Amino acid sequence: SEELLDLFNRQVTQEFTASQVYLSASIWFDQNDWEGMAAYMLAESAEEREHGLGFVDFANKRNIPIELQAVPAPVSCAEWSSPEDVWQSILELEQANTRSLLNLAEAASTCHDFAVMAFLNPFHLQQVNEEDKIGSILAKVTDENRTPGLLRSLDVVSF
Amino acid sequence: SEELLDLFNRQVTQEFTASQVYLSASIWFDQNDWEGMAAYMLAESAEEREHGLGFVDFANKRNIPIELQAVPAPVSCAEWSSPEDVWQSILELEQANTRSLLNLAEAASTCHDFAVMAFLNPFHLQQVNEEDKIGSILAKVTDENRTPGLLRSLDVVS
Amino acid sequence: SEELLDLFNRQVTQEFTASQVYLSASIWFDQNDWEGMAAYMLAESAEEREHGLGFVDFANKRNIPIELQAVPAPVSCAEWSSPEDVWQSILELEQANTRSLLNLAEAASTCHDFAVMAFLNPFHLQQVNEEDKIGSILAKVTDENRTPGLLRSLDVVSF
Amino acid sequence: SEELLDLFNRQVTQEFTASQVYLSASIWFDQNDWEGMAAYMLAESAEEREHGLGFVDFANKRNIPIELQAVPAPVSCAEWSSPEDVWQSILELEQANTRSLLNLAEAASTCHDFAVMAFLNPFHLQQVNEEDKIGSILAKVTDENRTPGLLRSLDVVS
Amino acid sequence: SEELLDLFNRQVTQEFTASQVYLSASIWFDQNDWEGMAAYMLAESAEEREHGLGFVDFANKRNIPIELQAVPAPVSCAEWSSPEDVWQSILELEQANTRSLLNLAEAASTCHDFAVMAFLNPFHLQQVNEEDKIGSILAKVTDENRTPGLLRSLDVVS
């Protein structure tokens, strides 16, 4: 179906966009001396790109044509003031990645595309884990950051 | 999706309930000198609990709120007088685990919960193997128990 | 000895009950982003079940009849609003486990059940260790929570 | 202490007595072509002797005077005409040994002999396991011998 | 020599005295859920005893008569209400031990006891390291305890 091919193409763009946003978070963290949180964001950036490549590769095999779209400039970095701002932005990113996979799966289900739904399954489960990890880091960051200097202690140690 | 959350919380209860029935089956076999069969039921009891912990872990990560319900006292163990009774009860238990997994999957499907459906898939297939395994053992048990003493050699060997 | 057969049977129930309470504590910790405390409670839940099975196995061989009772829904969890609440409830549970083991031993003693008395010995010892370990964690949790965010710091370090 | 010292000496004799009965059970099984059951009884005979020796050793260290009494000739072997009969005798042998271990423990408890009570603990636990094992074998022997030749078929599987 | 022989005997007592104070410090830390600090004090208690023994051994070889005196009950533990107090007591304990090692060395120097001075050399150096270590820990304990719960957080990191 039309809607599936459009949405599959969109996934790729979303994977790459997320990759750039993670890279952006990593730069903010490094600029502000959060090397542990920076390394985490760089690792996620690489992974989001791998997810994009995996979609490209499945599309190529299934003859879903991929036309690469622009990857927008990340903008949230203009407003980030603290680690909590960055993690919040990152949680919203993953929640959108999730929604985006659910919309693609629904479109696959509508046209009985069982191969695509099958392909999507490990991604649905990965998203559940991702959103859980980020939600949890954001809670820690918010909590630790109630005492001056304490958040700084667990970048240098845990990340 | 309020039905999905309810059936999920109930699924955990079903895993733990089944875990307790296997233990009772284990106890009946031990009390009646069927050590091999008791050992079997013990392993399955541990396994059912692991499934329950699996469901709990997924629900936590997915913000499906879990409230632990009572785990009922196993009841069929009061009735059992031969190994065939025990295995028949266990078959019915596995058939009930399967239905409650299929009902949970149906509620997930209805509300387009693709992650829950994805999570359930390995459980669907495992229920297929488990029912088949129980059904087969129950067939050997029924058959072998037609000769006095013969069923003891299923236990002593296998 | 009739008393002893009843208390032995209730002892199995108490192990499975505490197993379930430890689980409820795991859920609350996970729900509230305390993964180290959660994993700790989950390990405890497993070990409590193993003790239950140890009791069952002994009763089977000593011809003490085991009829498995219902395992009640844990109730404390409905009331917990901090890690300190949870650990306090865990202390009370192990103090309750200690008492039920001492009552069981006391009944064994009265009817000269030397085998059961011998059976319980490693459990008496184990309880001394469990209570001390929990009392101690509760002291650390209580102290560290006097500074905002600090308790969070040691869910990652310890555990 | 005199009751305790007498029962301790009595307990050595009971171990050695038990060892000889196990040996006569092994002779019987062997004479009757039950080699696996004979091997079982032979290992138990040596095991009973080892317990006797453990007792002797503790008594020497604790200055409990040991004088070796006669080891009575086993008489139960006169009545045995099937494997079931032999397993029944051994069960009762093991129950007899439990009771006199318990009698010894009560004498120790009355005279506050904490060291002797401590020494006895692993034996009390061992007896639970042994009576369970023997009771369970007897149940299997009894069930299997309901069909001609079947008991024979499971002796070679051990 | 009589001053030297008396101070040598006095020095054995001081080692054993120090060992007991370290042990009471470990009891305190333990009673108060400071397990890492308790482990530290426990290893130091055994270490102090080892030094006492080294002294005893040298005195036997050198024909310096040793008569073991009473090891006084530690009293400083009565006043301790925080980890800071305990570390302060231990620092002063270690400073007390340095001075009496130095007093022993001066008695040896006055009576030209070159062998005893040689024996003492590694202890003099060890004391420099120990007082430095204890002084440094105390500084950290004092700084960290300025923030509620913080001292607690660094006990588990050791």
Short mmCIF file of N, CA and C in Angstrom, two decimals, chain C residues 132 135-137 139-140 143-147 150 153-154 157-158, chain E residues 30 32-35 147-157:
data_model
loop_
_atom_site.label_atom_id
_atom_site.label_comp_id
_atom_site.label_asym_id
_atom_site.label_seq_id
_atom_site.Cartn_x
_atom_site.Cartn_y
_atom_site.Cartn_z
N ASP C 132 20.44 -8.88 60.47
CA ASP C 132 21.56 -7.97 60.61
C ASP C 132 21.85 -7.26 59.29
N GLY C 135 18.71 -4.80 58.81
CA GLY C 135 18.79 -3.73 59.79
C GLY C 135 19.83 -2.72 59.35
N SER C 136 20.98 -3.23 58.93
CA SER C 136 22.09 -2.43 58.47
C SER C 136 21.78 -1.62 57.20
N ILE C 137 21.14 -2.24 56.21
CA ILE C 137 20.76 -1.53 54.98
C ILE C 137 19.78 -0.40 55.29
N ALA C 139 19.56 1.23 58.09
CA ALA C 139 20.35 2.31 58.72
C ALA C 139 21.05 3.20 57.67
N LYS C 140 21.62 2.57 56.65
CA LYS C 140 22.27 3.28 55.56
C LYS C 140 21.26 4.07 54.73
N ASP C 143 20.01 7.08 56.82
CA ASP C 143 21.03 8.12 56.97
C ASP C 143 21.23 8.89 55.66
N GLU C 144 21.39 8.15 54.55
CA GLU C 144 21.68 8.74 53.26
C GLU C 144 20.52 9.57 52.71
N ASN C 145 19.31 9.24 53.15
CA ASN C 145 18.14 9.98 52.69
C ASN C 145 17.90 11.34 53.39
N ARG C 146 18.78 11.71 54.31
CA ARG C 146 18.76 13.02 54.95
C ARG C 146 19.27 14.13 54.00
N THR C 147 19.92 13.73 52.91
CA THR C 147 20.30 14.66 51.84
C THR C 147 19.54 14.32 50.55
N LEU C 150 20.88 11.88 47.47
CA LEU C 150 22.03 11.08 47.90
C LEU C 150 21.75 9.58 47.94
N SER C 153 22.24 8.01 44.73
CA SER C 153 23.65 7.82 44.40
C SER C 153 24.13 6.41 44.65
N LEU C 154 23.60 5.78 45.71
CA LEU C 154 24.10 4.50 46.18
C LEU C 154 23.20 3.31 45.81
N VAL C 157 26.00 2.50 43.16
CA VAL C 157 27.25 2.07 43.80
C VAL C 157 27.07 0.72 44.52
N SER C 158 26.41 0.70 45.68
CA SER C 158 25.97 -0.57 46.27
C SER C 158 24.96 -1.27 45.34
N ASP E 30 30.71 -1.73 63.92
CA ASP E 30 29.79 -2.77 63.54
C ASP E 30 28.40 -2.55 64.17
N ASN E 32 27.04 -0.05 64.88
CA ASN E 32 26.47 1.16 64.29
C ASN E 32 26.39 1.15 62.77
N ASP E 33 26.53 -0.04 62.20
CA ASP E 33 26.36 -0.29 60.77
C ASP E 33 27.38 0.42 59.86
N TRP E 34 28.62 0.51 60.34
CA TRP E 34 29.77 0.96 59.57
C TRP E 34 30.70 -0.22 59.30
N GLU E 35 30.25 -1.14 58.45
CA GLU E 35 30.97 -2.40 58.18
C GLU E 35 32.35 -2.29 57.54
N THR E 147 28.01 16.85 55.71
CA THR E 147 26.78 16.74 54.95
C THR E 147 26.09 15.47 55.42
N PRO E 148 24.85 15.57 55.94
CA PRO E 148 24.11 14.38 56.42
C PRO E 148 24.03 13.23 55.41
N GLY E 149 24.43 12.05 55.86
CA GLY E 149 24.39 10.84 55.07
C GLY E 149 25.59 10.61 54.16
N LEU E 150 26.42 11.64 53.96
CA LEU E 150 27.53 11.52 53.02
C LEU E 150 28.61 10.55 53.51
N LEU E 151 28.92 10.60 54.80
CA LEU E 151 29.92 9.70 55.35
C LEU E 151 29.53 8.24 55.11
N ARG E 152 28.23 7.99 55.22
CA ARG E 152 27.63 6.68 55.01
C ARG E 152 27.91 6.19 53.60
N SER E 153 27.85 7.11 52.64
CA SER E 153 27.98 6.77 51.23
C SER E 153 29.40 6.33 50.86
N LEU E 154 30.40 6.79 51.61
CA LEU E 154 31.78 6.39 51.33
C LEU E 154 32.34 5.24 52.19
N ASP E 155 31.55 4.74 53.15
CA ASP E 155 31.91 3.53 53.91
C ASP E 155 31.78 2.27 53.05
N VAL E 156 30.78 2.25 52.16
CA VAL E 156 30.58 1.12 51.24
C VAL E 156 31.63 1.07 50.11
N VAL E 157 32.29 2.21 49.86
CA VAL E 157 33.43 2.28 48.95
C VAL E 157 34.73 2.02 49.74
#
